[PDB]
Amino acid sequence: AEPFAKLEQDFGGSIGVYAMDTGSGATVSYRAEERFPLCSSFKGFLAAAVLARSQQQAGLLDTPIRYGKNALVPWSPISEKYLTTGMTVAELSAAAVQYSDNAAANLLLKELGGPAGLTAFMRSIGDTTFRLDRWELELNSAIPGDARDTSSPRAVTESLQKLTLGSALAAPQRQQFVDWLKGNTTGNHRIRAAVPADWAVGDKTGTCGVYGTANDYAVVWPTGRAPIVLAVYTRAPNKDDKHSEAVIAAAARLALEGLGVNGQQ
């Protein structure tokens, strides 16, 4: 606890961590059951929900979605680029996960019946904590004490484990989910920065832009051992408090250390 508390003190906000060693079942928790805004991190679970749906709806992933300029909310760099052709459900999913593309996320949410649809999927896999309430971009408000669009580090890690390593998805879909996470482009300075270059990592980040609120969750494969699943979330009390990637990386290192996993040569 003390090392995490010192990290909080220097950062000026709150940090929540839950890490599980899938080999032994050993865990590290710090504020693991407190609520933190999901920010864009809900998009990983959104992609998992789309994959689950594909298991009972043949051809879903290949389906072309032809959206208009009306769909292009800010921070949609992939969606903007493909406006004139449209994108398949698969393409939208990869864009949402690997680039946090907002338009792509909103289109996929619509496919699943909105924030309530994604929430009902999470409940279906045994996650009673996750809630998505709003769409992009309103879900990013991260107002202290607001339960909308939040989950806990523990629930995030447990759900991530079920979807990537457990039986929540069929084997093909499970591998697609893992591959999407592995191809993420936005997380190089977070959980990835806590581990050596040759450990496989799949992750999804969230960065609300306000209230020092940002996060990352990941599956990590250390050379020669069972994977670790972990979530690192932050928030802070003032709207203008800046997030820190460095604090997330540091908390990840502490979590891994607490499991006897470190990147020391």
36, β-bridge pairs: 151
Residue written as token pair 């020092």? 212
Which among 195, 213, 215, 219 is positioned nearest to 205, based on CA atoms?
Answer: 215
* 138 classed as catalytic: yes
* 151 classed as catalytic: no
Could you say which of 40, 41, 151, 152 is catalytic?
40
- How many Å separate Cα 171 from the centre of its chain? 20
Q: Where are the beta strands (DSSP E) in the chain?
A: 14-21, 27-30, 36-37, 64-65, 87-88, 150-151, 200-207, 214-221, 228-235
Could you say which of 24, 33, 124, 138 is catalytic?
138
What φ, ψ does residue 237 adopt, rounded to 5°?
Answer: -80, -20
Burial class (CB in 10 A: 0-12, 13-18, 19+), 190: buried
Count of C-beta atoms within a 10 Å radius of residue 186: 17
Q: Is 28 helix (H, G, I), strand (E, B) or coil?
A: strand
| Angle subtended at Cα 48 by Cα 196 and Cα 96, rounded to the nearest 5 degrees | 75
CA atoms within 13 A on the CB side of 144: 11
Resolution (A): 1.6
Percent helix, strand, coil in the chain, to 5, is 40, 15, 40
Q: Which domains does the chain have, with CATH numbers?
A: 1-265 (3.40.710.10)
Approach to solving: X-ray
Residues, the chain = 265
How far, in Å, CA of 119 to CA of 125, rounded? 10
How far, in Å, CA of 165 to CA of 181, rounded? 13
Count of C-beta atoms within a 10 Å radius of residue 257: 16
